[PDB]
From Swiss-Prot:
GO molecular function: ATP binding; CoA-ligase activity; metal ion binding; Photinus-luciferin 4-monooxygenase (ATP-hydrolyzing) activity; protein-folding chaperone binding
UniProt source species: Photinus pyralis (Common eastern firefly)
Protein name, as recorded: Luciferin 4-monooxygenase
Role, per record: Produces green light with a wavelength of 562 nm.
Cofactor(s) named in the record: Mg(2+)
Length: 427
């Protein structure tokens, strides 16, 4: 009974052709041609980096990795706290079809080895503070041939930086605006291998392309308006950070980052950078329900606070009230679904609804002992189907088939119901 399968609407704008790297490249080139356009801002050290800087260095890294010898058969790891440099190797790799495996930078050596034993990288990009851990892992995973330091200008402790790596490999006369990203099959070529012992989640380029249609949707994402700024405290190596940020870059927004949470910096940054949209991890919502300092800042530019999910009905309402917002912009997604597949539509927040099925997707709820599909206001297991579902867990077809059934439905593990307006609620 199709009336019991909720479907997203058609996307505001039609899904664009091209790999995720081609689409990012094309949009970034354009912002690059407008001097002063800010891509990232590090709120701790107060430095901005523009789209022209970001674009040029991303293109240079892509060409350098290609000349070094990386192609679609290789993976890289990016292991770092949020920083201005984080997305440089991510973009460079997407531009040439090299899969990117972000490794949690607070994993100790063991969970790190487990993660990198799955992704099997040839090159690892690391911040200065992660170098020791990577060197200790490399002792056990000889596939790691090359370690490149992200947040350094010069070489660092005998390792090249992104800058000196690039200078070692670029041909003479290299032109960043003549460069053309690689073209390849966006269903078969993996863009990201995300962690969730954790497993590795392979996400084809297609899934990011679909995200890029949601991100700029006026209903399911953020409308492209000039001088939009986002404050993001979420980790870039996790799906909430990775896939919002990639979409913010497509949109030309200013991504103000923090790599560690502090109350006064966070609030002062909302005020002073006139943030329109702020992202919080789940336990930062409980924090802000306790906060009283909110009242002392001018937050009149703030339009939304977005959660990654699903929040408790109470904590959600408490936060929305302290920030004088009508509600929280909720998402529900898993690492296995790339990003959010139920999202609060812009304007149309409800109570403790998580939101509505995004474009390209389907969702249903099924009876828990039988697998049968349910009708409205009935509680069952949330299942979703659509082109952001992962290709599978890396080297683990059994965990894959356990999650995703033969008709392509992912079984989320969560209990839900949908209502007469087609809003979903996680219970």
């Amino acid at each position: 009974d199709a009336k019991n399968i909720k479907k997203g609407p058609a996307p505001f704008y039609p899904l664009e052709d091209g790999t995720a790297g081609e689409q990012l490249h094309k949009a970034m080139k354009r912002y690059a041609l407008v001097p002063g356009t800010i891509a990232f801002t590090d709120a701790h050290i107060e430095v901005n980096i523009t789209y022209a800087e970001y674009f040029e260095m991303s293109v240079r890294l892509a060409e350098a990795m290609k000349r070094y010898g990386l192609n679609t058969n290789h993976r890289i790891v990016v292991c770092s706290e949020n920083s201005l440099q984080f997305f440089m190797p991510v973009l460079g790799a997407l531009f040439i079809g090299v899969a990117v495996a972000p490794a949690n930078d607070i994993y100790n050596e063991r969970e790190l080895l487990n993660s990198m034993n799955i992704s099997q990288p040839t090159v690892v990009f690391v911040s200065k503070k992660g170098l020791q851990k990577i060197l200790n892992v490399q002792k056990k995973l000889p596939i790691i041939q090359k370690i490149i330091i992200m947040d350094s200008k010069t070489d660092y402790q005998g390792f090249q930086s992104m800058y000196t790596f690039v200078t070692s490999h670029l041909p003479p006369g290299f032109n960043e605006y003549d460069f053309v990203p690689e073209s390849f099959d966006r269903d078969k070529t993996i863009a990201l291998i995300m962690n969730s012992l954790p497993k590795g989640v392979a996400l084809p380029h297609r899934t990011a392309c679909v995200r890029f249609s949601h991100a700029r949707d006026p209903i399911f994402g953020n409308q492209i308006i000039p001088d939009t700024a986002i404050l993001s405290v979420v980790p870039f190596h996790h799906g909430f950070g990775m896939f919002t940020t990639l979409g913010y870059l497509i949109c030309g927004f200013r991504v103000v980052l923090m790599y560690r949470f502090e109350e006064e910096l966070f609030l002062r940054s909302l005020q002073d950078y006139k943030i329109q949209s702020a992202l919080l991890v789940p336990t930062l919502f409980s924090f802000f329900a306790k906060s009283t300092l909110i009242d002392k800042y001018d937050l009149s530019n703030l339009h939304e606070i977005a959660s990654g999910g699903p929040l408790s009905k109470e904590v959600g309402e408490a936060v929305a009230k302290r920030f004088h917002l009508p509600g929280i912009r909720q998402g529900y997604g898993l690492t296995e679904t790339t990003s959010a597949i139920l999202i609060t539509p812009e304007g149309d927040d409800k109570p403790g609804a998580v939101g509505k099925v995004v474009p390209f997707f389907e969702a249903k709820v099924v009876d828990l002992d039988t697998g049968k599909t349910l009708g409205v206001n009935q509680r069952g297991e949330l299942c979703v189907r659509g082109p952001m579902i992962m290709s599978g867990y890396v080297n683990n077809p059994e965990a894959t088939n356990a999650l995703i059934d033969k008709d392509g439905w992912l079984h989320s593990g969560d209990i839900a119901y949908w209502d007469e307006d087609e809003h979903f609620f996680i219970v």
